[PDB]
Amino acid sequence: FVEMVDNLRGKSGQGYYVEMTVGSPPQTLNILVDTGSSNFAVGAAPHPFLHRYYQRQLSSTYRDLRKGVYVPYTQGKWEGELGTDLVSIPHGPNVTVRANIAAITESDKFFINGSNWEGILGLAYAEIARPDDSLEPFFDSLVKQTHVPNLFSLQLCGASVGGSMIIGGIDHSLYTGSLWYTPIRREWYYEVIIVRVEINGQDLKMDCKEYNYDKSIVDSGTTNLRLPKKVFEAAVKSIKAASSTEKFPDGFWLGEQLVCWQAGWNIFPVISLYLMGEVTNQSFRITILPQQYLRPYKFAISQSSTGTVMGAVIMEGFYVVFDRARKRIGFAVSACHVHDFRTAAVEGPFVTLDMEDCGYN
Ligand SMILES: CN1C(=O)C[C@@](C)([C@@H]2C[C@H]2c2ccccc2)N=C1N
């Protein structure tokens, strides 16, 4: 898939985007790659902060759906007008698809002043698509209308950042070792189940339901490793305890402040998440380094009321395969992850009982 390798661009903290074309004749747009939502939504009006926007008046293949959608968030918000058009991905499958498009006509604190992307590619499932699950997400259209296989994979490599979105397959050069698969619990978000958490090898000994309360998702659209409050609580003290060589202000661990050192790692613990495996009572762990959770530094582990979010802190350490056809997600050590002595790891198999109990209901 040499043509799809390195098809992702971005800026640090502003997300990863892929180039797409929309309409006839094609209009090029940079589009955020977002495994955490399910709408294909593009700016369609001259917002001052956007480099370009979808102009429906220029497209011969645009079709109005005569329906509006309103989408609020934790901070941001957008509303738009639904329609359909021909969509392509220049550095992807040589293929063209009619997909739903939410033409964004108004927004607040959503788009990023400074970013080079003007749209969102929600790669998650219909169940959380807005207004409702009747609105066929892009990837479902891609699979129905073409012979592109029902999966994609992401390597996020991390001032410019880069990566690859292999659509319809797996490029074996982007990972070392073996891929280990965790089941997608339910097809809405990419929901997974964490069955054990170790800081530096030491179990936090929490009930495994807390790790996934109320959920645990894989989200390319999130920067941090976001954990539920109670888990995050226990995580920080363990990490703090493991890092007693030097001291830090309490507020910083809450992201309410930054920290900085001098040019020219070991005083920080590795972090392992055990995931439900493919077989009963078997699991595997993914391990990250401080080079993943200390972003150039800021502590890149936050607390959450929406559950565990495995954001770029996790994804930049691994090659992640979204095997939709087999309802599972594969993790492998990324060939582009930054390391020291130590190295990001994906290891198994392990025996873990009652893993299904770790899920929340
Ligand atoms: C975490 N998340 C959101 O808050 C909503 C969206 C749709 C939004 C595109 C993500 C985003 C995060 C920060 C700034 C702008 C957009 N995607 C997400 N996965």
Curated annotation (Swiss-Prot):
Monomer. Interacts with RTN1; RTN2; RTN3 and RTN4; the interaction leads to inhibition of amyloid precursor protein processing. Interacts with SNX6. Interacts with PCSK9. Interacts with NAT8 and NAT8B. Interacts with BIN1. Interacts (via extracellular domain) with ADAM10 (via extracellular domain). Interacts with SORL1; this interaction may affect binding with APP and hence reduce APP cleavage. Interacts with NRDC AND NRG1. This is Beta-secretase 1. The chain holds residues 60 to 446 of 501 of the full protein. It is an enzyme of class 3 (hydrolase). Residues 16-332 form the Peptidase A1 domain. Induction: Up-regulated by the Ca(2+)-regulated transcription factor NFATC4. Glycans are attached at residues 94, 113, 281. It comes from Homo sapiens. Responsible for the proteolytic processing of the amyloid precursor protein (APP). Cleaves at the N-terminus of the A-beta peptide sequence, between residues 671 and 672 of APP, leads to the generation and extracellular release of beta-cleaved soluble APP, and a corresponding cell-associated C-terminal fragment which is later released by gamma-secretase. Cleaves CHL1. Changing residue 34 to N: Decreases beta-cleaved soluble APP production. Its EC number is 3.4.23.46. Keywords: Acetylation, Aspartyl protease, Cell membrane, Cell projection, Cytoplasmic vesicle, Disulfide bond, Endoplasmic reticulum, Endosome, Glycoprotein, Golgi apparatus, Hydrolase, Isopeptide bond, Lipoprotein, Lysosome, Membrane, Palmitate, Phosphoprotein, Protease, Signal, Transmembrane, Transmembrane helix, Ubl conjugation, Zymogen. GO terms for molecular function: amyloid-beta binding; aspartic-type endopeptidase activity; beta-aspartyl-peptidase activity; endopeptidase activity; enzyme binding; peptidase activity; protein serine/threonine kinase binding. Residues 1-361 are extracellular. GO terms for biological process: amyloid fibril formation; amyloid precursor protein catabolic process; amyloid-beta formation; amyloid-beta metabolic process; cellular response to amyloid-beta; cellular response to copper ion; cellular response to manganese ion; detection of mechanical stimulus involved in sensory perception of pain. Changing residue 214 to N: Almost abolishes beta-cleaved soluble APP production. It is a single-pass type I membrane protein. N-Glycosylated. Addition of a bisecting N-acetylglucosamine by MGAT3 blocks lysosomal targeting, further degradation and is required for maintaining stability under stress conditions. The modification N6-acetyllysine is found at residues 67, 205, 209, 215, 229-230, 237. It catalyses: Broad endopeptidase specificity. Cleaves Glu-Val-Asn-Leu-|-Asp-Ala-Glu-Phe in the Swedish variant of Alzheimer's amyloid precursor protein. Disulfide bonds join 157-336, 208-358.
